[PDB]
Symmetry: C2
Subunit: 79 residues, 2 copies
Protein backbone atom coordinates (compact mmCIF):
# COMPACT_ATOMS: atom_id res chain seq x y z
CA UNK A 1 0.00 0.00 0.00
CA UNK A 2 1.25 3.46 -1.01
CA UNK A 3 -1.32 5.07 1.28
CA UNK A 4 0.00 7.88 3.49
CA UNK A 5 0.95 6.29 6.80
CA UNK A 6 -1.54 8.31 8.90
CA UNK A 7 -4.23 6.64 6.82
CA UNK A 8 -2.96 3.07 7.59
CA UNK A 9 -5.18 0.84 9.66
CA UNK A 10 -3.82 -1.70 12.12
CA UNK A 11 -4.46 -4.22 9.34
CA UNK A 12 -2.08 -2.46 6.96
CA UNK A 13 0.63 -2.49 9.67
CA UNK A 14 0.44 -6.23 10.27
CA UNK A 15 1.09 -6.68 6.52
CA UNK A 16 4.58 -5.13 6.73
CA UNK A 17 7.51 -7.54 6.86
CA UNK A 18 8.45 -8.39 10.47
CA UNK A 19 11.98 -6.93 10.50
CA UNK A 20 10.52 -3.57 9.48
CA UNK A 21 7.69 -3.19 12.00
CA UNK A 22 9.83 -1.22 14.46
CA UNK A 23 10.60 1.16 11.51
CA UNK A 24 6.91 1.76 10.77
CA UNK A 25 6.27 2.46 14.50
CA UNK A 26 9.25 4.80 14.84
CA UNK A 27 8.07 6.62 11.76
CA UNK A 28 4.47 7.04 12.95
CA UNK A 29 5.60 8.05 16.44
CA UNK A 30 8.04 10.72 15.25
CA UNK A 31 5.70 12.07 12.59
CA UNK A 32 2.87 12.74 15.04
CA UNK A 33 4.67 13.31 18.35
CA UNK A 34 4.87 16.95 17.57
CA UNK A 35 7.21 18.35 20.15
CA UNK A 36 9.81 20.47 18.37
CA UNK A 37 11.47 18.42 15.67
CA UNK A 38 14.79 20.10 16.59
CA UNK A 39 14.69 18.42 19.97
CA UNK A 40 13.42 15.03 18.77
CA UNK A 41 15.48 12.11 20.08
CA UNK A 42 15.46 8.48 18.89
CA UNK A 43 14.28 6.38 21.81
CA UNK A 44 15.33 2.94 20.63
CA UNK A 45 14.26 1.17 23.82
CA UNK A 46 10.90 2.90 23.81
CA UNK A 47 10.22 1.95 20.21
CA UNK A 48 11.41 -1.61 20.76
CA UNK A 49 9.23 -1.96 23.91
CA UNK A 50 6.08 -0.61 22.38
CA UNK A 51 6.34 -2.44 19.03
CA UNK A 52 5.30 -5.90 20.17
CA UNK A 53 2.62 -4.33 22.39
CA UNK A 54 1.39 -2.51 19.25
CA UNK A 55 1.37 -5.64 17.08
CA UNK A 56 -0.58 -7.18 20.00
CA UNK A 57 -3.01 -4.22 20.37
CA UNK A 58 -3.40 -4.13 16.57
CA UNK A 59 -4.19 -7.81 16.28
CA UNK A 60 -7.03 -7.35 18.79
CA UNK A 61 -8.47 -4.36 16.89
CA UNK A 62 -7.62 -4.74 13.19
CA UNK A 63 -9.72 -1.83 11.90
CA UNK A 64 -8.40 0.78 14.29
CA UNK A 65 -6.14 3.54 12.99
CA UNK A 66 -2.49 2.37 13.14
CA UNK A 67 -1.07 5.80 14.03
CA UNK A 68 -3.61 6.01 16.90
CA UNK A 69 -2.63 2.62 18.39
CA UNK A 70 1.02 3.82 18.36
CA UNK A 71 0.28 6.95 20.39
CA UNK A 72 -1.75 5.09 23.01
CA UNK A 73 0.88 2.45 23.55
CA UNK A 74 3.54 5.12 23.56
CA UNK A 75 1.44 6.82 26.26
CA UNK A 76 2.53 4.19 28.81
CA UNK A 77 6.25 4.43 28.11
CA UNK A 78 6.35 7.92 29.64
CA UNK A 79 3.19 8.41 31.72
Amino acid sequence: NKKPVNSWTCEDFLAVDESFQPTAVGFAEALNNKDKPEDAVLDVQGIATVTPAIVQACTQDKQANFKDKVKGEWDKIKK
Copy 2:
Protein backbone atom coordinates in the same frame (compact mmCIF):
# COMPACT_ATOMS: atom_id res chain seq x y z
CA ASN B 1 22.43 8.58 22.47
CA LYS B 2 20.72 11.76 23.64
CA LYS B 3 21.57 14.10 20.75
CA PRO B 4 18.49 15.17 18.77
CA VAL B 5 18.48 13.22 15.44
CA ASN B 6 18.54 16.48 13.40
CA SER B 7 21.85 17.24 15.19
CA TRP B 8 23.45 13.86 14.44
CA THR B 9 26.58 13.62 12.25
CA CYS B 10 27.42 10.38 10.35
CA GLU B 11 29.55 9.29 13.31
CA ASP B 12 26.48 9.27 15.57
CA PHE B 13 24.53 7.15 13.06
CA LEU B 14 27.33 4.64 12.62
CA ALA B 15 27.11 4.10 16.39
CA VAL B 16 23.54 2.85 16.15
CA ASP B 17 23.44 -1.00 16.12
CA GLU B 18 22.85 -2.46 12.67
CA SER B 19 19.41 -3.77 13.72
CA PHE B 20 18.08 -0.28 14.41
CA GLN B 21 19.67 1.75 11.62
CA PRO B 22 16.66 1.58 9.23
CA THR B 23 14.46 2.78 12.15
CA ALA B 24 16.86 5.73 12.54
CA VAL B 25 16.64 6.44 8.80
CA GLY B 26 12.83 6.34 8.84
CA PHE B 27 12.70 8.53 11.98
CA ALA B 28 14.86 11.15 10.24
CA GLU B 29 12.49 11.10 7.21
CA ALA B 30 9.37 11.57 9.39
CA LEU B 31 10.93 14.70 11.00
CA ASN B 32 10.83 16.29 7.55
CA ASN B 33 7.04 15.73 7.24
CA LYS B 34 5.87 17.51 10.41
CA ASP B 35 3.89 20.33 8.72
CA LYS B 36 1.45 18.11 6.76
CA PRO B 37 1.61 14.71 8.48
CA GLU B 38 -1.44 13.31 6.68
CA ASP B 39 0.56 13.42 3.45
CA ALA B 40 3.68 11.57 4.68
CA VAL B 41 4.40 8.32 2.84
CA LEU B 42 6.51 5.54 4.39
CA ASP B 43 8.11 3.36 1.73
CA VAL B 44 9.45 0.42 3.73
CA GLN B 45 11.26 -1.26 0.86
CA GLY B 46 12.86 2.10 0.02
CA ILE B 47 14.08 2.41 3.61
CA ALA B 48 15.39 -1.19 3.36
CA THR B 49 17.34 -0.42 0.23
CA VAL B 50 18.69 2.97 1.11
CA THR B 51 19.85 2.34 4.67
CA PRO B 52 22.99 0.34 3.77
CA ALA B 53 23.87 3.03 1.18
CA ILE B 54 23.71 5.75 3.84
CA VAL B 55 25.84 3.61 6.17
CA GLN B 56 28.51 3.38 3.48
CA ALA B 57 28.25 7.08 2.60
CA CYS B 58 28.60 8.01 6.26
CA THR B 59 31.67 5.77 6.68
CA GLN B 60 33.39 7.78 3.95
CA ASP B 61 32.32 11.21 5.43
CA LYS B 62 32.06 10.75 9.24
CA GLN B 63 31.92 14.51 9.95
CA ALA B 64 28.83 15.13 7.77
CA ASN B 65 25.27 15.89 8.89
CA PHE B 66 23.26 12.61 9.01
CA LYS B 67 19.96 13.98 7.61
CA ASP B 68 21.86 15.52 4.68
CA LYS B 69 23.28 12.02 3.71
CA VAL B 70 19.81 10.51 4.14
CA LYS B 71 18.46 13.08 1.66
CA GLY B 72 21.41 12.68 -0.68
CA GLU B 73 21.11 8.91 -0.95
CA TRP B 74 17.32 8.96 -1.27
CA ASP B 75 17.61 11.54 -4.11
CA LYS B 76 20.00 9.22 -5.99
CA ILE B 77 17.37 6.49 -5.65
CA LYS B 78 14.30 8.33 -6.93
CA LYS B 79 15.43 11.06 -9.34
